Amino acid sequence: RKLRRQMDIIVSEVSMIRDIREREIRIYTDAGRICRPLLIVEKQKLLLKKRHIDQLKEREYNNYSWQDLVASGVVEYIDTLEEETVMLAMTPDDLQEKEVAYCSTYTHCEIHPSMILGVCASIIPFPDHNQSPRNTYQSAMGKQAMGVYITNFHVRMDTLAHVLYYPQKPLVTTRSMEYLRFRELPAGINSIVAIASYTGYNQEDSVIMNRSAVDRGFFRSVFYRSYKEQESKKGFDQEEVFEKPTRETCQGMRHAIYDKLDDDGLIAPGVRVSGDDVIIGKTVTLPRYTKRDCSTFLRTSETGIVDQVMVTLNQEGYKFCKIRVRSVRIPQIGDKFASRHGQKGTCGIQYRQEDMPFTCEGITPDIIINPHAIPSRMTIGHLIECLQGKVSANKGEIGDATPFNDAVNVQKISNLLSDYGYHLRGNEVLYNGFTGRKITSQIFIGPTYYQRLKHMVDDKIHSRARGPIQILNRQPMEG
Amino acid sequence: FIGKIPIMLRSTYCLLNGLTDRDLCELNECPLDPGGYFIINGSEKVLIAQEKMATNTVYVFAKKDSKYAYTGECRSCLENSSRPTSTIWVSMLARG
Amino acid sequence: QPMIYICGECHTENEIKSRDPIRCRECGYRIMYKKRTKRLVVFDAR
Amino acid sequence: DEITPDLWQEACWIVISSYFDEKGLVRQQLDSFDE
Amino acid sequence: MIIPVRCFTCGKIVGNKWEAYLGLLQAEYTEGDALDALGLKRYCCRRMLLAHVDLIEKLLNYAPLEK
């Protein structure tokens, strides 16, 4: 252990396990062992001292990095087999003396217990206040959320891509989201959410959305699709060429008008396109004579605008083109939304600002979700996030929702909120928009980070009346 | 020359290794892009870590739904060999 | 007839003829982009 | 010398920040391929 | 990517506030003080500025296609 902590002959990756009950010492230098760093504990003290923190604070200047902590024998990598023999303190508070000592023989301490979470679960605020399956559900829905997936998206011709107009970073964050770069590339918008029953259109995991907010760009997104095609000269007999086909020479020309193409057989950026529009004109010479149409058509029910057109040569030197079509998507009924707590639903209806319930100020909710989700779901993290988000928006800071934080509890947040002139539990008196009458019950309302998921109704709606059929069996096609 | 090896992006042997954010942006690359994937025919490919039982370790499992009361197992494997790992079992017969 | 393309590297506009391989006359780059259409594009500011 | 709780929170997150400044989030992939 | 012209909730104009907000912050204003100075009282308008991420600078870091 001394050698490994000094890094003389045994590298940090090496595991050394002593089974005392047995009489075996097992040393592993193999690859593929999962390990994690832990703070070393001497008699009852951390080896990490104030001087190490002081040196790390100036890591930009003094070139004191994480490697120096490992070199000074203050932190150690422990794999599972070695973890079997470790006496682990959850926090340095466990090393303090107690009237009745529990262990008094700790060998290691956790750097922070929140590091047990992965990338996706690290963005959930107050995850220790939710039922675990809801955290699991958010772990996937976060991967389905819309944001700015990468900063150089303008230069990538990806087959599918979604970009949100106005991504925001959450008002309520965890400390681990700093390292996930969620600040730089966020996927969601802080929304004023009221948990209320209002006209019945948010029942059974549906949500009511503010149409005036949508008019202002709320959760507006743009969808990109890329089409690729190449002209092959495989044989002296048959060759494909990019060109604007004419019905006299080409035979299999669909009834779609080919006038949107340029003389090179390609559509130009900025041209509006619809389903069954030709975007790449291509013909193949036969072994309406001597040419067969093999043009590329926009997918049925796509209706975008050509974003850019790239022309190159592929590996075999043949001419190669990629066309990106963009489609602006305005959130509508049937689109899927979700908070960071497994609370997901489709938009059931949209009301304009004047029809929405309002506070004594001019504030109307951006989203109204139904109270009947919380009881069985038990996503108290959602409610605490709403409360802390209201506090943080009024105060002008970013709330901290790191999971296992004793310095933050609901009572402290409530006391903070009362200082800003609001009911301490986040409730508010709302007026009915249709009649202007006060609502007898007061409504829980506040900012909550919401995500727009890639599942949109206009990419799912489908109907058929006697279309194409399969060759082998004469039954309708699939998809 | 014996072949070509696809290169994982941002690794030691990628052209982007140790480039500043300004240099990456000059190449139309996102500085926040973490790398760790390949480009095969223009498609970004990521290798998923595969779990397996550790080698060179003795494991004793009990299978009373079988002829053996107890079974020792060791997936022995030298450092490297085109020969796969060699598994040797040592078991004691079930009574009766 | 001209079919102007923009080079991806040097950003130079150069004529390209159908059946002519894609290559920038200045720097020899093999990636080019089509220029924006001249057709009337009108949007509602909604 | 010794870190106190009120200092402990900041200290622990400074340590974690230094770790992530050194390693990143895909270090295992890059290290395996480099090996 | 760029500061929204209006607050989503109430429609107050916030698109002329981002540069001023950045300036006040470098003048050692706290974010709450800066929001107060800019006249953003309702917490929806305050959220607009507090949660904004100016991604357009990162996009401006890339060279344009046409010279």
Added chain:
Amino acid sequence: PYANQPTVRITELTDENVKFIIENTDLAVANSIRRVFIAEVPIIAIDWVQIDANSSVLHDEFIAHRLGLIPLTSDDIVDKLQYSRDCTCEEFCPECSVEFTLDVRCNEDQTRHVTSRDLISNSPRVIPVTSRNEQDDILIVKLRKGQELRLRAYAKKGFGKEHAKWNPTAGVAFEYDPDNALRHTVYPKPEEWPKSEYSELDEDESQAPYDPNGKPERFYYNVESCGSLRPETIVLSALSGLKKKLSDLQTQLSHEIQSD
């Protein structure tokens, strides 16, 4: 059996908001006036954009939507203008629209901020609110060297019912019965609810005693303008528009009744 006789008091009147109280009217009328403030007060806003060039990092619809959200001074012109749908002209004319042009190119190494200051109007009385003689200009897009934006836009008359860009308000505060005398809300724990700014109660008293014979009167308003209209102009236009709606309904009903 007959009409109410409302009275009005103005408590605050600035360039951005008007605060006033209406008394001796019904709750339905007050709420309808509020709704008309939000949704049925006509305004001039950009609703037609032709893009001649756009080399910015934002796509055309992004720019057009941002332009549509820019408020324009409409105080006196809007009453004169016709709805473009009602005009007898071709695409547009001075009787139903206002033309705007924008032509900005970045030829320097410092980022060029395209703001509403670059929106050049054909009508001196219809211009971006931030361009009126502090408050900065509304950012449209940022350009780097070599990027350019050139477009032509028309501003038309409309109201918030069609699109929120024609909504003249920036928050309509509405309140009645500050102390809960009518018990239209029921507080489980009244003592922990902050007092309304219109409350007239001692600090030891949480809410007024129940009033069995009470009715909602004395409605409190704080209309905040987005800059396109003066707040008092918003209120007067709302009253006129609601009256016009009622008059049109009266004419149609008279025709329908006489027809039978």
Added chain:
Amino acid sequence: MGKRVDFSARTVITPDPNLSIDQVGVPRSIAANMTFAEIVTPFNIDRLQEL
């Protein structure tokens, strides 16, 4: 035992408290893409001619 069938449609479901329990709200595009063959009779010839 099972087949793909013509004259079928699929889309997301959303609530509607203002429909009878025996009603279903159908989008216009779906309704315009599916047809029912109505036999012409002197009773309905005018309506079908208009259609």
Added chain:
Amino acid sequence: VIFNRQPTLHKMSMMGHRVRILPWSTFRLNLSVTTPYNADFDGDEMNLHLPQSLETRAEIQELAMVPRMIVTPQSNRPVMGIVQDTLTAVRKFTKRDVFLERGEVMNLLMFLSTWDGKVPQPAILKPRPLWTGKQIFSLIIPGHINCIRTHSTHPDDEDSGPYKHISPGDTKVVVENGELIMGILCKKSLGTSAGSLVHISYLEMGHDITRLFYSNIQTVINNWLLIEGHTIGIGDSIADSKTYQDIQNTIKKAKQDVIEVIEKAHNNELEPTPGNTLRQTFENQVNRILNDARDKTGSSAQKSLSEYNNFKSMVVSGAKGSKINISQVIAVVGQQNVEGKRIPFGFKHRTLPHFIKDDYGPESRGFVENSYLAGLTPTEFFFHAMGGREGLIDTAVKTAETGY
């Protein structure tokens, strides 16, 4: 049309509907019809089939329309009831002290499709004529049907003492001659259980009258809910300090009891019950102690709830949630189990490296002594995650077994 949601489990997974054309791009469904389909609106998709001949249209019209499917032969009871918003709002609406003004009654009657145009005499005439919610609901009820039910909070001793026929708590739903004379309506009265109001409507009147009954309940009650309102917030998850102190005392006593049992077992002063070895007996005692503690804390949390508490409103109406949910939100979450047992020693004689070896106490083996509002400690968080993973797996496997 024929409407269908997969998986198609029973007859009521494919029912006939009448088409109404609406603007946007989704299929629109009445809320009450979601239960037969097992559908919700978190991204569910459903299939539509259009019969192509007069014969198939007549078949669907006469055999498979939604109103004919109201009662299932599987259990001789309705498959459709009144659901979450309408159920909670109707529970609040039929309370004894619900009074409506002239205009409110006029609006609600505006939303009653079978109304005969006669405004009933108000229950209170002087001062200020006032109608009760029971009067309006009686207007909703069809025909002259007779039904007796009990509200969920009906005390068990009431039916044997005095006030059996004049309920102090307004439990004991009585519908006589089509009139709601008494009682608070809830799931037991408007749900899918046998003998409910909707079941008796279907049996006494036809399917058409019952269809109108469903629709009218929903419309009228939702429009009243626009006035009443309904929410859930942080305030409903809190309890008074006395309740918190009682819960903490109960937990501490339970922990001391478990410590005493452990000490008894360690000194060989524990005797196995018949048919059980020593370890099973010790586990039985520990689980008994912890279950009793959980029940006591849950009862305390239940008692702390006020009449305005929204969790309790939802639970009492039967719309959503149970008393266990309230106990877990307000009081301890409780014991975490894997395969019916406390958290196993995944490490060597240890559940996690943060404990000592052979620690059989509640914390070590996965007793979560915190509520969801208080938040779980890291070890409790991990044990709870294990527990939830169990249920996810169970779903994922049972699906295929049951399908075969």
Added chain:
Amino acid sequence: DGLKYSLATGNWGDQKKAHQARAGVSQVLNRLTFASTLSHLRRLNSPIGRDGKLAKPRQLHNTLWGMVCPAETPEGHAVGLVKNLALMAYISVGSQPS
């Protein structure tokens, strides 16, 4: 071509013995959002086989503490078999024991 095929199709093995080879290695990088990409680059797979119905391999073992996220796992047929690394977890690359 061997390396190209294995990386392009994800079948880890010779193109001729594709049925014998294990599939699902070398998936297409997910780019829906940045978090999706990061999670995909930190993904672990158990080759047990999704068809199996034994709950034991899908259960959250105690030893996952600090190594594998206890929350992130697909909720479908692969629940418990596809895992994700915890934030500070590291995997050794190996070294000579000499």
Added chain:
Amino acid sequence: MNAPPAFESFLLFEGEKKITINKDTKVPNACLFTINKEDHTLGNIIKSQLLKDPQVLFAGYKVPHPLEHKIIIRVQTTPDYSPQEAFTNAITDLISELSLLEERFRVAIKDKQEG
């Protein structure tokens, strides 16, 4: 894709009538007024004004469906009165109240501006 144009909520479609009058046959002296391209604003104000009339026995309105743009107003009066007369008088009363309110707001604005 299936989105209605925004103007559909306030623009009458060709051949559509602004207001239609039908008789309610359930009870005497009752009429149903169907108004197209109107919403809670007009319906609510008209209903409240009608409720102010002592000769009106019933007054109510509803929007049959939020995705449609129709309001139905039901009015019942005493036999000495007519629902048509009640409707006309209610509209006249509302117009008078609005005119008075506009005049008084103008006066108050002038007073505030001078001082």
Added chain:
RNA sequence: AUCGAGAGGA
């Protein structure tokens, strides 16, 4: 177009 694979949705 076919086949396979993978990722997802309910």
